[PDB]
Ligand binder design. Structure first.
Ligand SMILES: CN(C)NC(=O)CCC(=O)O
Ligand SMILES: CN(C)NC(=O)CCC(=O)O
Ligand SMILES: [Zn+2]
Ligand SMILES: [Zn+2]
Lengths: 363, 363
């Protein structure tokens, strides 16, 4: 029984699973603020039922695959995945649409990475306000910087009944948001504990990965249905698979933030080592980390220069970032990492000062 | 309007509040295991609806105040609190019972710290199995040790309609479990973020504390009703007040554990500084911390000697413990702390080795 097949999907559709109501949070749009995530942390998935309060702009629930073609362009190349084959290829949007409205489910093709920020569709979609407030790339990537900026903020997903993405950790160790405009997507979510990540590493690397459903090798695997109008926020590192049970069109975006930097760095190293992608969807992770380190320094200085105290999560995030900095500039590591260090940053001094301010805020 | 009064209670009974369903977890007895709390962490309150799976032994829901007198003894001294006065006194259990079954609510007296481990009532009550598995004092306090062992594992609470305990952090920075045998207790729970603890410190110390309801000075204050048969587990540090709305008899116990040692140490220092108690309900906190540090060392050694990796939460707990150790044995601090160090412990060496093993498990 191979991961993808109509018999695999058919079994999956029946599968038991641990309820999502156990771990997820279900705030409302207006409740999902920066304070809410600072206080609660962002370590479990978050399903908002209605979009009111999220600050999203979206087309109506009657937008279509054809509307997508209209706004992106028939000729744009798009990555498609063959779901009864788990393999990647380019395809012209037009041919996708041909295939789509045909009904010829002889192949099950799935589109999940159509990034449309440089198309006229960009103007019809605004991402959640929470994401825009948190996002590193959005807030802290400088304009004077001559490194390639990652552009992963807006994706369109068109997914046909019985599509399946297998268990993975997202590129960059990014966090993700998904809004289902129409249809449904079932997410199977597994917590990224050191314990589970080890089983995950082993399973990626396993010789017969394609024959083993990873959610059976772990303690808890949570089924979370994302129906029409609903929005899912998945935290850093969460190992997840996706079954699209009926035709679905969804939107989504990937971001990094300052709430659990240790888990971000961890999710980065692991996804780097296990990824079979030919390209980095998220180039220059380390570059953005460097720039964040200095911003974090400035914040500590500011908080101390005016006799206030930083939140615990940031102190730990800072410490974790600093370790990564030392690790990337050790004499033997430095050649794999040098190219990511922005030319304005004096790493020894950053590390030294970041270390000093962190010592001053420990008990 | 002073904290305690029938007009204060009367207003409280009406008060709006943020729903508890937002932050609490509601597992079942069998789901509440050591793994469950390691994976989920124990950073939000946990309400189990039915006792099945908790491993508790308890008398029936028809046990009474008189049964308590029977098993503890009429003559035992018990701390009582005058709720329209927020003041502490001793009283003979007998006189409490007289007062209790009288119905003379001219004074509102409340019993919340009757510790019955050395009475015949001890044999009728067994605490949850989760607590017994986690508890430092239960598992790691050695018998060869000549320090006074804290005895806070079993409390009986008899609380009359309109009783009120004001907002506090529990002694020792301990975590707490409460089972309501009969009646109800409403808990008003506030997260112990650095942000909220500062407002809390300020409010404790405020000149007119008695006139200000602390749950109005904070972002989020959660009403959590604990009705008959239900069991509440409150985590380290949570600032909470209690309204007993109808007559209630409940049981409970206080424990420390290894899941969030940093917050435990923090909750300790703060509660130490703000407490107006004449005695330490939890003597020798630091002593037990020393012994836990060495056990944690042995675990790191063991995990490394057999090429396995410790869970992140423990690595951080260890690091936080080690800082406290350095802080308590600095040349100038040492005289306030020396007396708590068990004579078998070579602190410089413990700290040095604990520091080394923690370095070996960082990226
Ligand atoms: C790969 N990741 C970024 N995207 C997904 O997990 C979504 C794929 C899907 O919805 O099938
Ligand atoms: C003080 N703490 C340990 N106990 C409480 O918070 C319970 C008091 C009550 O139930 O009124
Ligand atoms: Zn993904
Ligand atoms: Zn308490």
């Amino acid at each position: 029984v191979k991961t993808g097949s109509p018999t695999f999907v058919r079994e999956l559709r029946s599968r038991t699973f641990d309820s999502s109501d156990e771990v997820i949070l279900k705030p409302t749009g207006n409740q999902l603020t920066v304070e809410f995530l600072e206080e609660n942390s962002f370590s479990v998935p978050i399903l908002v039922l209605k979009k009111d309060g999220l600050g999203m702009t979206l087309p109506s629930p009657s937008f279509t695959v054809r509307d997508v073609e209209h706004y992106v362009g028939s000729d744009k190349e798009i990555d498609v995945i063959d779901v009864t084959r788990q393999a990647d290829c380019k395809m012209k949007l037009g041919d996708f649409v041909k295939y789509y409205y045909s009904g010829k489910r002889e192949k099950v093709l799935n589109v999940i990475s159509l990034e449309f920020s440089d198309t006229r569709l960009s103007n019809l979609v605004e991402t959640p306000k929470i994401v825009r407030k948190l996002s590193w790339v959005e807030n802290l990537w400088p304009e004077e910087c001559v490194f390639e900026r990652p552009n992963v903020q807006k994706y369109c997903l068109m997914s046909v009944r019985d599509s399946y993405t297998d268990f993975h950790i997202d590129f960059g160790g990014t966090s993700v948001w998904y809004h289902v405009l129409k249809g449904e997507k079932i997410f199977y979510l597994i917590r990224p504990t050191n314990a589970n990540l080890t089983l995950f590493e082993c399973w990626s690397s396993s010789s017969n990965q394609n024959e083993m459903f990873f959610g059976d090798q772990v303690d808890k695997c949570y089924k979370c249905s994302v129906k029409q109008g609903q929005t899912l926020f998945i935290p850093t590192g969460w190992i997840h698979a996706v079954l699209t049970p009926v035709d679905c069109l969804a939107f989504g975006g990937n971001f990094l933030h300052s709430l659990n930097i240790e888990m971000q760095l961890k999710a980065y190293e692991i996804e780097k080592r296990l990824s079979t992608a030919d390209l980095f969807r998220f180039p220059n992770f380390e570059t953005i980390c460097w720039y964040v380190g200095k911003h974090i320094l400035d914040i500590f200085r500011g908080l101390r220069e005016n006799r206030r105290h930083p939140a615990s999560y940031l102190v730990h995030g800072g410490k974790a970032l600093n370790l990564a900095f030392r690790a990337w500039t050790r004499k033997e590591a430095l050649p794999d990492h040098e190219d990511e260090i922005p030319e304005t940053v004096r790493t020894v001094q950053l590390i030294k000062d970041l270390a000093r301010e962190i010592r001053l805020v420990e008990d």
